[PDB]
Scaffold this active site. Structure first.
Site, PDB file in Angstrom:
ATOM      1  N   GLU C  45      -7.302   1.646  -2.017  1.00 45.64           N
ATOM      2  CA  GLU C  45      -8.027   0.368  -2.187  1.00 45.64           C
ATOM      3  C   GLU C  45      -7.820  -0.423  -0.906  1.00 45.64           C
ATOM      4  O   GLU C  45      -6.693  -0.434  -0.379  1.00 45.64           O
ATOM      5  CB  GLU C  45      -7.437  -0.373  -3.377  1.00 45.64           C
ATOM      6  CG  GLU C  45      -7.664  -1.870  -3.452  1.00 45.64           C
ATOM      7  CD  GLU C  45      -6.683  -2.616  -4.325  1.00 45.64           C
ATOM      8  OE1 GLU C  45      -5.475  -2.311  -4.437  1.00 45.64           O
ATOM      9  OE2 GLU C  45      -7.107  -3.595  -4.986  1.00 45.64           O
ATOM     10  N   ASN C 108     -13.962  -6.582  -4.159  1.00 41.66           N
ATOM     11  CA  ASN C 108     -12.951  -5.569  -3.810  1.00 41.66           C
ATOM     12  C   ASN C 108     -13.640  -4.275  -4.219  1.00 41.66           C
ATOM     13  O   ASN C 108     -13.914  -4.120  -5.417  1.00 41.66           O
ATOM     14  CB  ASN C 108     -11.717  -5.784  -4.683  1.00 41.66           C
ATOM     15  CG  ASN C 108     -10.594  -4.767  -4.305  1.00 41.66           C
ATOM     16  OD1 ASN C 108     -10.969  -3.664  -3.858  1.00 41.66           O
ATOM     17  ND2 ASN C 108      -9.381  -5.200  -4.515  1.00 41.66           N
ATOM     18  N   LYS C 125     -14.341  -3.989  -8.206  1.00 39.77           N
ATOM     19  CA  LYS C 125     -13.218  -4.189  -9.106  1.00 39.77           C
ATOM     20  C   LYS C 125     -13.577  -5.202 -10.199  1.00 39.77           C
ATOM     21  O   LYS C 125     -13.841  -6.375  -9.892  1.00 39.77           O
ATOM     22  CB  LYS C 125     -11.960  -4.562  -8.366  1.00 39.77           C
ATOM     23  CG  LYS C 125     -10.667  -4.632  -9.249  1.00 39.77           C
ATOM     24  CD  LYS C 125      -9.522  -4.831  -8.213  1.00 39.77           C
ATOM     25  CE  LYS C 125      -8.109  -4.875  -8.757  1.00 39.77           C
ATOM     26  NZ  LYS C 125      -7.069  -4.768  -7.627  1.00 39.77           N
ATOM     27  N   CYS C 170      -7.249  -0.040  -8.351  1.00 38.12           N
ATOM     28  CA  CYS C 170      -5.943  -0.697  -8.615  1.00 38.12           C
ATOM     29  C   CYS C 170      -5.657  -1.069 -10.050  1.00 38.12           C
ATOM     30  O   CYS C 170      -5.705  -0.157 -10.895  1.00 38.12           O
ATOM     31  CB  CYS C 170      -5.815  -1.903  -7.688  1.00 38.12           C
ATOM     32  SG  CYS C 170      -4.069  -2.425  -7.392  1.00 38.12           S
ATOM     33  N   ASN C 195      -2.800  -0.778  -4.416  1.00 41.65           N
ATOM     34  CA  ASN C 195      -1.815  -1.480  -3.677  1.00 41.65           C
ATOM     35  C   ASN C 195      -0.975  -2.120  -4.806  1.00 41.65           C
ATOM     36  O   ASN C 195      -1.260  -3.233  -5.285  1.00 41.65           O
ATOM     37  CB  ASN C 195      -2.261  -2.616  -2.712  1.00 41.65           C
ATOM     38  CG  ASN C 195      -3.041  -2.094  -1.529  1.00 41.65           C
ATOM     39  OD1 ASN C 195      -2.605  -1.870  -0.378  1.00 41.65           O
ATOM     40  ND2 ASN C 195      -4.295  -1.834  -1.845  1.00 41.65           N
TER      41      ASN C 195
END
Ligand code: XE
Ligand code: XE
Lengths: 302, 302, 302, 302
Positions: C45, C108, C125, C170, C195
């Site tokens: 990501e 994202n 995301k 994520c 992350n």
């Protein structure tokens, strides 16, 4: 042959928290244990104080105040008193300072105390982890090799009420030999305490494996020797250093049967059948049938 | 110092399947390994035949047909020729029959062959599991103690291309001693094969722990000696006996970096960095710094 | 129907480290992938920059430079050109800035690129972790809710070469809804980057569980939907923040078939068989035979 | 808000073992539980009889004899009287038969009984696993779909003494939707019982993952909803079919805090703090803050 074993995990013990304050925390756990039918409870390594080997000491008097010169002294006495009137045995870790002809011996020690309150065995830490010199870059030191000497009692196994019990202390659990020596002496329960930081300064790339390695060690050890085991942590953030939780109790097959989930004082318990050891020691790890010590010589060379 | 290590798991090998047919399955796995950059591949224990210790043989000639009288013979030479052409080392397990001094010795063996196709080293299984005589109250026999005798080569570690490699065979991986003798010889990689049924007649209450125990053994061994490891199973339903799958490759920290998911012939691979062993061996398991062999002598008593 | 899938883990990306430098690292992972037979590789990501949401930003332009306005731009082009030259597909994560109708939209995002180099599909995301305003008790902010807005593409599943592939980003992997929406669309491979800090300010009592909860999520999601999955971390000590390693590839049974062991750029790979999805989805999780959506309406209420 | 929860696993229940005998076994576990300070104990699915859906029934009277027509009947009454005398609530699973205008309804049911002996809630299995008609090759059948109809009470959460509790039965624990519906209703404890063979005829290649898939479902379910959970197996070799053990209790972080290690009647316990659900539910899985049901609509389509 059947009993309820417990682990009395400790949360942090501050640097100036008193032994009287700690004992009070231990008594409350014994009380909790007794309401859950416990017969023996395991307390952590160095259970009467903060983890003092995290600092570099310049004062011997100051260093010596973290050691017991008797066991128990007046302040630790109520623990003993309370545990026998409840008829609960326990494994206690503490720093031991003994004076031999004016020479001071220091040991990281643990003792087994039966249901009557008799001390029936002692063990002194043989594998002292960490480093030797003060190391400026660390956020906290690990100077056990400076504050203790390696134990001189070997890895003994003792009769404690119905069971054969061996002890280990903290880093000892990581060495297969610790377990195997007590497995060869027929221990049915191997138990001890730990203070294990979740950060390791020289190899921080293993930090996210701290719990994995702790539990791996406990499960393999038990399984290989067919012994119940138990590990009682002093855990959470102590003086700025995060100590691993995941105190535990493990079956002779290496299954984890109880586990803490807080980082505070916490009692976990498990039913132990000492004849369950047979499922391993009379079968796949029947040592007279299968072990081959005539080819393991290199292990004992020094 | 960096390589790609593989495991070539085998699916069942019928009693009638020929050595030519098995060898053709081993060749197909080297083609696959070649396609994934592999430099060394671990094959199973007793990889050329069905697992014959499950039966009780009365005909000594019938028992001998499962053994190799040379390595390789004509039927097994194409494996050696094709691996040396592709540049891939391998570990092969096979049943070995050798006549010395008037005795027909039988051993459960493994060899390490380097990427030139030279046989660099042998090992002959020291911990033979199971039993010596026919046991009517078990559904399938495990007559390894009857069909083999314990190895006479100790647990050696051999230079194989750039790496220090040690071998185990099956049941050996359960004994911490196996791994520690090779760890003390500075093995970087420890590897071998296995046939492990998922049913254990005398203690069937451990059957749903078969994979657990196998992996626990590999993980703890690797961790404690800081060695990469790999275990190549011969797996699935073979002649009515289910054998465990979960062949694996394990890093020095005890982490499983590769695992099989089928019960058929299947290649798994991992990147190995031989300098990663130092993360444990120059630190937490720095033996000169912390191991205490002076208190382990009971381990070597016989 | 059979391929080799890879995960391309990134170690830390500094605050001053350039997009050109970060693409050269990606490129080196692609060629390491190509030597190991890989057909598709998953990258982390926000793979082109440091993890900027740890900081509170005042200067819009300063914030804006972390975002892509084109995909790819001249600097990211060579990744796309080389991937199509090697004929490997990839999943790339990055910050996207789209101006539409007077609103600066920040997402994202991740994209799938097939082996011929065609951008086949996007995902933004949906579940943004963290907080929206600067909060004083954290050494690193987690301002994803300020720096991004939730995705507006749902959870799409795309055809990519032979396979039906869905993306997560994520924290999305922690919600069973993410996986189940893609599972109900037939995804065979579910993949994405992450992350994940190993310290959680508001519930630091769960830090030693970071790996446990990341892997638990990936295994459960794969198992429940009978999907292969892969998660690519951007890991190690980044700008003072330690991010979790353990990038992985998981089979449709939930077994972990590949796992990273370093906190540096690292490629892991696994054989994927798109037909193994059936073991689960034609059987225990045959949704037409067993799912009961009539009783699940509360999950969709808002 | 603090309580001691337990699981009363059951070893095998023979085809002709009477309810009186089973009840007698249950009473023994309640004594054991009471000695360990338990407040609530979870019993298995279909806990009064042998697992009768393994056989093909051709006689109505024969099938009917395994069902309760009342709860409790005289024979089962003493379970309720002793539990209530001891002050221990319990979750019991049994086969329910009810006649509605001459039509027989059949459910695989479970009830929550509070510490005063009042039945405060019922649940009826919604995800019936297994096949609908006799399948000759199987060694044992799995005919739940034929002997029961799917439940008609959705997935309810009830007030039980201090706690909010939801039920699941057996295969229900594998669907993330079971757990989510009760997590969205505030369940603090999600519990229920199971009968899980360690051999699955159609996909025998997952048999060595039976424990793995059971625990994974339990850990994932608990972690995602922030709920304590507990699963009570009826385990061991029952009428020739081996049932999985590994009954467990699980914290709201998905950590297993108690695990059984035998395949007989066994009681395991764990301290539960109903305020611990907040570690997840106020933070990482703060549903109001983080969940996005607007994009989960496909989950509820039917
Ligand atoms: Xe050992
Ligand atoms: Xe869900």
């Amino acid at each position: 042959r059947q009993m309820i074993l417990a682990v009395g995990q400790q949360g942090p013990i501050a640097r100036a928290e008193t032994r009287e304050q700690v004992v009070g925390r231990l008594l409350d756990m014994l009380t909790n244990a007794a309401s859950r039918g416990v017969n023996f409870i395991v307390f952590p390594e160095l259970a009467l104080t903060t983890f003092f080997p995290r600092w570099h000491f310049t004062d011997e008097a100051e260093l010596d105040s973290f050691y017991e010169t008797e066991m128990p002294g007046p302040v630790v006495r109520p623990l003993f008193e309370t545990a026998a009137e409840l008829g609960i045995g326990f494994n206690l870790g503490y720093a031991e300072l003994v004076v031999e002809g004016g020479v001071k011996r220091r040991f990281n020690t643990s003792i087994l105390v039966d249901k009557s309150g008799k001390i029936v065995g002692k063990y002194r830490k043989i594998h002292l982890p960490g480093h030797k010199e003060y190391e400026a870059y660390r956020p906290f030191q690990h100077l056990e090799k400076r504050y203790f000497e390696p134990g001189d009692l070997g890895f003994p196994v003792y009769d404690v009420d119905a069971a054969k019990m061996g002890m280990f202390i903290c880093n000892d659990r990581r060495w297969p030999e610790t377990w195997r020596v007590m497995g060869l002496k027929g221990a049915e329960i191997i138990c001890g305490g730990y203070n294990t930081p979740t950060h390791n300064p020289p190899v921080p790339q293993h930090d996210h494996l701290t719990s994995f390695h702790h539990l791996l060690s406990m499960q393999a050890g038990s399984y290989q020797n067919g012994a119940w085991s138990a590990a009682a942590g002093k855990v959470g953030m102590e003086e700025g250093c995060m100590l691993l939780g995941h105190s535990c109790i493990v079956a002779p097959t290496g299954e984890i049967v109880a586990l803490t989930t807080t980082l505070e004082d916490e009692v976990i318990t498990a039913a132990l059948d000492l004849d369950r050891c047979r499922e391993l020691r009379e079968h796949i790890f029947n040592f007279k049938a299968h072990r081959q010590p005539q080819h393991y010589g290199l292990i004992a060379e020094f």
